[PDB]
């Protein structure tokens, strides 16, 4: 047959690419020689086309002007600080070690200095639970308990824009406009509505999948469709 | 008495033993950070070079070339093929790595011609060979009764036509007797059967 | 809309043009590559053995 849609994706053609050229900034923690002295002033609050969430423009003492992954509650004028000795208030960034356990955090680094990887979407947050001289245990929004180097920097507070998911799109048109701001092919045609040549679920006098939908982890691309390595399906039990 | 050279040779018989073993562990680190083709002022295996034709003279160049280890980097078929030809993983190229290295070096020095080459080891995925090239246009070479032969027009691009050291061995021309029926005088003249 | 005559009307785009290297109206001005001599793609001249019968 023909390569299935999931395979066209990888080639990275226009249709599957994100409108990068239309994006604003790659949100990452600033680099500080040391000392922490680094502080700056919120100059404005903008909309981030890549995350459908607000972002804060900040002017730093040493002249640097960069957009920042804004937590909820940051306003123009506020003074943010980044470093080991940063005060402990929302919007400030400092290593997990210097952060008091029990405090909600966002934009957490996977490894010290990577600029933040975890908890960055609308209204989410990580939860610093345990400290140590060797391991900082954080609970990520997925519920998992992650062990991190206490040297990993983070931002205090939860990400701005919480509750975005609460309102339904209501109409195809709204999805449309959102989708146009992401690296995604939309709308979605069901495999079972295709021809046998286009998808392992395609074909038939009526619409139904050919075999069972749970596919092995070892299935090859072109065949790995449906419920991938499902440990279970349905809702019962 | 033993020539000093004889010692370089002796050392390279077992490149994973003694001092040379440690040198290699050292060098490769820098090599792995170097490019595909790097001209070097002096041959890592002096005895070998000289044995191959190398001379500390103007117009004589040496260069280390890195080549990936393994079989052919082959693309699977995109049309009909009988089972016999649907192969990918086990297919290997008919040209040995040392020959590839010689060609890559030669292309880096369009004006030079390959004289010979020898191996200088390998790690888990590279293989390094040092290629000795010659400037057929530099007097000093044109005037050398032992290398001037490479200046002849008939020798333009020796490597690309397999007239090289490894070139001739890879072509199965080693033996003068049994086994070289489809080899000598050339593979192509023999319908490409060796 | 018919794919024939009615779709022939929008054809006012210029692509292939007189080539600077070979003189054939085969220089694709959009691609900057000659389909006839290879100009723009190859220093060597475009030529294939299939342009003639195998034994000739």
């Amino acid at each position: 047959g023909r390569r299935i849609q999931g395979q066209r994706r990888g080639r990275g053609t226009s249709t599957f690419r994100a409108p990068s050229h239309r994006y604003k900034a790659d949100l990452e923690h600033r680099k500080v020689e040391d000392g922490d002295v680094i502080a700056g002033t919120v100059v404005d609050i903008e909309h981030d086309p890549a995350r459908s969430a607000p972002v804060a423009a900040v002017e730093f003492e040493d002249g640097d002007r960069r957009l920042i992954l804004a937590p909820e509650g940051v306003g123009v004028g506020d003074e943010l600080q980044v470093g080991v000795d940063a005060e402990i208030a929302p919007g400030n960034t400092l290593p997990l070690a210097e952060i008091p356990e029990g405090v909600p955090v966002c934009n957490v680094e996977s490894s010290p200095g990577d600029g933040g990887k975890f908890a960055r979407a609308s209204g989410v947050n990580a939860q610093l639970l345990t400290h140590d001289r060797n391991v900082a245990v954080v609970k990520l929004p997925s519920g998992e308990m992650k062990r991190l180097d206490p040297q990993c920097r983070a931002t205090i507070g939860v990400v701005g824009g919480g509750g975005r998911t609460d309102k339904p799109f209501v109409k195809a048109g709204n999805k449309h406009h959102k989708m146009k701001a992401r690296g995604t092919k939309w709308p979605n045609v069901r495999g079972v509505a295709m021809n046998a040549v286009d998808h392992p679920f395609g074909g038939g006098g009526r619409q139904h999948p050919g075999k069972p939908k749970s596919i092995s982890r070892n299935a090859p691309p072109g065949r790995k469709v449906g419920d991938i390595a499902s440990k279970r399906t349905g809702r019962g039990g | 008495a033993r020539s000093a050279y004889s010692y370089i040779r002796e050392a390279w018989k077992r490149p994973k033993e003694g001092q040379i073993a440690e040198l290699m562990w050292h060098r490769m680190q820098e090599w792995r950070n170097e490019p595909a083709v790097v001209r070097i002022e002096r041959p890592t295996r002096l005895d070998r070079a000289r044995s191959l034709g190398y001379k500390a003279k103007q117009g004589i160049i040496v260069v280390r070339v890195a080549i990936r280890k393994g079989s052919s980097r082959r693309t699977r078929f995109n049309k009909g093929r009988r089972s016999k030809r649907m192969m990918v993983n086990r297919i290997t190229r008919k040209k040995n790595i040392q020959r590839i290295a010689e060609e890559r070096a030669n292309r880096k020095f369009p004006n030079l011609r390959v004289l010979n080459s020898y191996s200088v080891g390998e790690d888990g995925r590279h293989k390094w060979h040092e290629v000795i090239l010659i400037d057929p246009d530099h007097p000093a070479i044109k005037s050398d009764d032992q290398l001037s032969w490479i200046s002849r027009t008939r020798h333009r691009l020796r490597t690309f036509r397999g007239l090289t050291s490894a070139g001739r061995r890879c072509r199965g021309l080693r033996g003068q007797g049994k086994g070289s029926e489809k080899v000598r005088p050339s593979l192509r003249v023999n319908g490409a059967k060796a | 809309t018919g794919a024939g005559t009615p779709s022939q009307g929008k054809k006012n785009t210029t692509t292939h043009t007189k080539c600077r290297r070979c003189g054939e109206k085969s220089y694709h001005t959009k691609k900057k590559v000659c389909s006839s001599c290879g100009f723009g793609k190859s220093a060597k001249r475009r030529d294939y053995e299939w342009q003639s019968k195998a034994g000739e």
Binding site: - | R82, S83, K84, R85, M86, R90, I91 | -
Partner: protein, 92 residues
């Protein structure tokens, strides 16, 4: 059917009748060094392996008698045509 374990009959070696002992031919083990073995290794490569890609024929409903007749005095055995027999059991 039944069959005596021992009985008198012609021994092609002795060239005269003598008591023979009947036994079922036990299969010999292969060495894996015969020409066919070397051709299998040699000729098997990428893709289908011609004849070496085939698999075990099948079975006839009843097999023929596969026996060894051993002379009781010279100790040399001889083979005979076999005959279809669903089962063969020796008497004593």
């Amino acid at each position: 059917m039944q069959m005596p374990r021992r009985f008198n009959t012609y021994c092609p070696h002795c060239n005269e009748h003598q008591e023979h002992e009947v036994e079922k031919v036990r299969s010999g083990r292969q060495t894996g060094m015969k020409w066919i073995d070397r051709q299998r290794e040699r000729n098997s490569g990428i893709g289908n392996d011609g004849k070496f890609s085939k698999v075990p024929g099948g079975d006839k409903p009843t097999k023929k008698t596969d026996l060894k007749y051993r002379c009781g005095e010279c100790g040399k055995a001889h083979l005979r045509e076999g005959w279809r027999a669903g089962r063969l059991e020796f008497q004593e």
